[PDB]
Amino acid sequence: RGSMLLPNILLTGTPGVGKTTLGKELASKSGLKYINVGDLAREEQLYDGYDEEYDCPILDEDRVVDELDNQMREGGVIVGYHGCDFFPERWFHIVFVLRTDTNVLYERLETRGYNEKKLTDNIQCEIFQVLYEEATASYKEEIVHQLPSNKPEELENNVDQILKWIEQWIKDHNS
Ligand SMILES: Nc1ncnc2c1ncn2[C@@H]1O[C@H](COP(=O)(O)OP(=O)(O)O)[C@@H](O)[C@H]1O
Numbered sequence: 452r453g454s455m456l457l458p459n460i461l462l463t464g465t466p467g468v469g470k471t472t473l474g475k476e477l478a479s480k481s482g483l484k485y486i487n488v489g490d491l492a493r494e495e496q497l498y499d500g501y502d503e504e505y506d507c508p509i510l511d512e513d514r515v516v517d518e519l520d521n522q523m524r525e526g527g528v529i530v531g532y533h534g535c536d537f538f539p540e541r542w543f544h545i546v547f548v549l550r551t552d553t554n555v556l557y558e559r560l561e562t563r564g565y566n567e568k569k570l571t572d573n574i575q576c577e578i579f580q581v582l583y584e585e586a587t588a589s590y591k592e593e594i595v596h597q598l599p600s601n602k603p604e605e606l607e608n609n610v611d612q613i614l615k616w617i618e619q620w621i622k623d624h625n626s
Pocket residue numbers: 464465466467468469470471472473559600601602603604605606
């Protein structure tokens with residue numbers, strides 16, 4: 452019922468940690484909408500510049516924000532991306548940074564067929580905790596949380612914890 456106020460959630464962390472697997476499952480089991488920012492920019496061609504080095508077009512951050520702004524004002528969206536400093540702070544009610552042990556994350560990305568230089572850049576992003584610090588610099592510390600994401604059983608505990616959070620938030624914000 453388009454009579455209920457619904458929350459917005461950010462899922463962030465290094466490529467490989469489990470963001471899209473977790474977001475699709477939360478969407479199926481809550482009725483909220485999951486948007487993968489990478490897939491959105493491909494579908495709507497939201498790019499400015501090309502990367503010869505990595506062989507890929509470069510994300511246009513301001514056109515991403517314009518494209519999503521009205522949907523975000525209406526509520527009930529889960530957003531997934533490997534960055535977060537350029538999103539409006541007002542968009543999110545809670546932020547989760549997914550974390551994966553370096554040994555486990557290395558094997559996930561190798562099987563996806565990343566080359567040597569791509570492997571190294573992402574493994575260093577995780578061991579230096581880059582996305583965790585970006586989140587704490589951009590949102591209030593009490594709404595930012597780290598989630599372990601190394602095995603099926605952790606995926607299952609994350610789904611259960613976030614589904615319960617969503618049910619309690621809806622009760623508190625529809626008196
Ligand atoms: N908790 C988990 N346990 C084991 N494998 C996982 C877990 N979460 C995700 N994966 C797997 O890791 C790989 C990358 O997950 P994905 O959703 O594509 O990462 P991201 O969206 O952050 O780049 C996929 O093969 C997926 O099945």
